[PDB]
Design an enzyme around this catalytic site. Sequence first.
Site, mmCIF file in Angstrom:
data_model
loop_
_atom_site.group_PDB
_atom_site.id
_atom_site.type_symbol
_atom_site.label_atom_id
_atom_site.label_comp_id
_atom_site.label_asym_id
_atom_site.label_seq_id
_atom_site.Cartn_x
_atom_site.Cartn_y
_atom_site.Cartn_z
ATOM 1 N N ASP A 85 42.909 35.468 43.151
ATOM 2 C CA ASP A 85 43.983 35.425 42.148
ATOM 3 C C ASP A 85 44.988 36.537 42.354
ATOM 4 O O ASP A 85 45.330 37.283 41.439
ATOM 5 C CB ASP A 85 43.378 35.510 40.738
ATOM 6 C CG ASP A 85 44.328 35.026 39.646
ATOM 7 O OD1 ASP A 85 45.462 34.576 39.916
ATOM 8 O OD2 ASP A 85 43.909 35.082 38.469
ATOM 9 N N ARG B 212 50.809 40.024 38.354
ATOM 10 C CA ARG B 212 50.125 40.296 37.075
ATOM 11 C C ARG B 212 48.787 41.001 37.297
ATOM 12 O O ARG B 212 48.258 41.631 36.382
ATOM 13 C CB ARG B 212 49.905 38.987 36.294
ATOM 14 C CG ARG B 212 49.090 37.951 37.035
ATOM 15 C CD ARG B 212 48.952 36.628 36.249
ATOM 16 N NE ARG B 212 48.259 35.669 37.103
ATOM 17 C CZ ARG B 212 48.861 34.843 37.966
ATOM 18 N NH1 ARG B 212 50.186 34.814 38.050
ATOM 19 N NH2 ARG B 212 48.126 34.148 38.838
ATOM 20 N N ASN B 213 48.218 40.905 38.507
ATOM 21 C CA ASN B 213 46.954 41.562 38.851
ATOM 22 C C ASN B 213 47.133 42.799 39.712
ATOM 23 O O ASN B 213 46.140 43.355 40.194
ATOM 24 C CB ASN B 213 46.009 40.582 39.563
ATOM 25 C CG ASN B 213 45.146 39.805 38.580
ATOM 26 O OD1 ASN B 213 44.640 40.375 37.583
ATOM 27 N ND2 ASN B 213 44.945 38.528 38.855
ATOM 28 N N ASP C 222 41.946 43.097 39.637
ATOM 29 C CA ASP C 222 41.684 41.735 39.170
ATOM 30 C C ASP C 222 41.172 41.824 37.753
ATOM 31 O O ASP C 222 40.213 42.541 37.470
ATOM 32 C CB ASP C 222 40.634 41.057 40.038
ATOM 33 C CG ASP C 222 40.408 39.601 39.666
ATOM 34 O OD1 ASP C 222 41.200 39.051 38.877
ATOM 35 O OD2 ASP C 222 39.431 38.994 40.165
HETATM 36 C C1 LIG Z 1 33.804 38.921 39.730
HETATM 37 C C2 LIG Z 1 34.583 39.916 40.470
HETATM 38 C C3 LIG Z 1 35.710 40.614 40.053
HETATM 39 N N1 LIG Z 1 36.045 41.430 41.106
HETATM 40 C C4 LIG Z 1 37.085 42.374 41.138
HETATM 41 C C5 LIG Z 1 37.322 43.149 39.972
HETATM 42 C C6 LIG Z 1 38.286 44.130 39.924
HETATM 43 N N2 LIG Z 1 38.404 44.821 38.738
HETATM 44 C C7 LIG Z 1 39.469 45.543 38.300
HETATM 45 O O1 LIG Z 1 40.550 45.567 38.906
HETATM 46 C C8 LIG Z 1 39.290 46.352 37.094
HETATM 47 C C9 LIG Z 1 38.012 46.624 36.540
HETATM 48 C C10 LIG Z 1 37.893 47.438 35.387
HETATM 49 C C11 LIG Z 1 39.061 47.983 34.790
HETATM 50 C C12 LIG Z 1 38.900 48.863 33.591
HETATM 51 C C13 LIG Z 1 40.339 47.704 35.328
HETATM 52 C C14 LIG Z 1 41.545 48.249 34.704
HETATM 53 C C15 LIG Z 1 42.262 49.172 35.281
HETATM 54 N N3 LIG Z 1 43.500 49.718 34.744
HETATM 55 C C16 LIG Z 1 43.976 50.889 35.259
HETATM 56 N N4 LIG Z 1 45.141 51.183 34.608
HETATM 57 C C17 LIG Z 1 45.377 50.187 33.696
HETATM 58 C C18 LIG Z 1 46.375 49.920 32.777
HETATM 59 N N5 LIG Z 1 47.429 50.772 32.670
HETATM 60 C C19 LIG Z 1 48.583 50.429 31.767
HETATM 61 C C20 LIG Z 1 49.395 51.673 31.420
HETATM 62 C C21 LIG Z 1 48.448 51.069 30.372
HETATM 63 N N6 LIG Z 1 46.289 48.805 32.003
HETATM 64 C C22 LIG Z 1 45.249 47.950 32.113
HETATM 65 N N7 LIG Z 1 44.230 48.138 33.001
HETATM 66 C C23 LIG Z 1 44.331 49.242 33.762
HETATM 67 C C24 LIG Z 1 40.454 46.887 36.483
HETATM 68 C C25 LIG Z 1 39.072 44.386 41.076
HETATM 69 C C26 LIG Z 1 38.886 43.644 42.263
HETATM 70 C C27 LIG Z 1 39.754 43.955 43.459
HETATM 71 F F1 LIG Z 1 40.944 43.446 43.271
HETATM 72 F F2 LIG Z 1 39.234 43.434 44.558
HETATM 73 F F3 LIG Z 1 39.904 45.249 43.610
HETATM 74 C C28 LIG Z 1 37.879 42.635 42.278
HETATM 75 C C29 LIG Z 1 35.141 41.226 42.129
HETATM 76 N N8 LIG Z 1 34.255 40.294 41.718
#
Ligand SMILES: Cc1cn(-c2cc(NC(=O)c3ccc(C)c(/C=C/n4cnc5c(NC6CC6)ncnc54)c3)cc(C(F)(F)F)c2)cn1
Length: 284
Positions: A136, A140-141, A154
């Site tokens: 995805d 937006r991501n 994500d």
């Molecule tokens: C099933 C599965 C999922 N995936 C997978 C998950 C991720 N998960 C995240 O990205 C993730 C996880 C947890 C959190 C708290 C966040 C949020 C972070 N965050 C930091 N600044 C902000 C922010 N700033 C605004 C000023 C306020 N507003 C909101 N959110 C914010 C992001 C990333 C990836 C990737 F893409 F491969 F890397 C793969 C792998 N298998």
Amino acid sequence: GSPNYDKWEMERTDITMKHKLGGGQYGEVYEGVWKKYSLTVAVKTLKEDTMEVEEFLKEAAVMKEIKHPNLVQLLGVCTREPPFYIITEFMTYGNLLDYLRECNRQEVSAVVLLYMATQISSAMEYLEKKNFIHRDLAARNCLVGENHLVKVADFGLSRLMTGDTYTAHAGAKFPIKWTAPESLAYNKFSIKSDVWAFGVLLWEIATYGMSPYPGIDLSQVYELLEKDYRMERPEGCPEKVYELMRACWQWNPSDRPSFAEIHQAFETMFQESSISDEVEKELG
Ligand SMILES: Cc1cn(-c2cc(NC(=O)c3ccc(C)c(/C=C/n4cnc5c(NC6CC6)ncnc54)c3)cc(C(F)(F)F)c2)cn1
């Protein structure tokens, strides 16, 4: 150093929880502070002990394995019991789509648009090495920090974000306008369908965050792609960058470039644009 030590687990009480980010459109994500270190963080939470835990733990497990300057960085987890947390670094400027839509274009100039694409393609080159299929990729991501730092993230948005972005398809919800043809038709996702989505993301960047395929109904997108229709070059978009979009949107996934190739191309264009930008800045 003791029997139940886990290097990634933190105590929930380590974190001051503050307000919800993203207005619900991004799910259960909150601003927090890691108290001992005076560090603002972001925290994703899952309150209940349901089958949703399986995917939450899968996400945490992947995030423990991936590490790159342009991927949002895991700092810790609380996953021994509910409520479950995933704690990451905080990106001060939020998601890239709204950043583009709200920016000052004298600051976010041509060289910065190339810088954004270069950073994202570097993250994706790394995910291609890991063989992690994102599924995805879209503005937006992505998240933005100081000095136009961009990282891929994500948020699992398909059942969180309401409106036209995601719609019913194949018993799930798909972002039809970012989805490769073989993913729409055969549910086939791969690094090459991430490459297709990256091409759409390039167009989002080039247009400062326009919605793709303007004025075209979702119902028509696949039929049009199959006839070889593709979005037109946006006003102001460099020809070389549009050529890369069109390469990303090759019908046959095997004909699309790798992210290694894409990143090298963008790094080269970015360095060239940077030279011109630095000279223009120096003059006056
Ligand atoms: C099933 C599965 C999922 N995936 C997978 C998950 C991720 N998960 C995240 O990205 C993730 C996880 C947890 C959190 C708290 C966040 C949020 C972070 N965050 C930091 N600044 C902000 C922010 N700033 C605004 C000023 C306020 N507003 C909101 N959110 C914010 C992001 C990333 C990836 C990737 F893409 F491969 F890397 C793969 C792998 N298998």
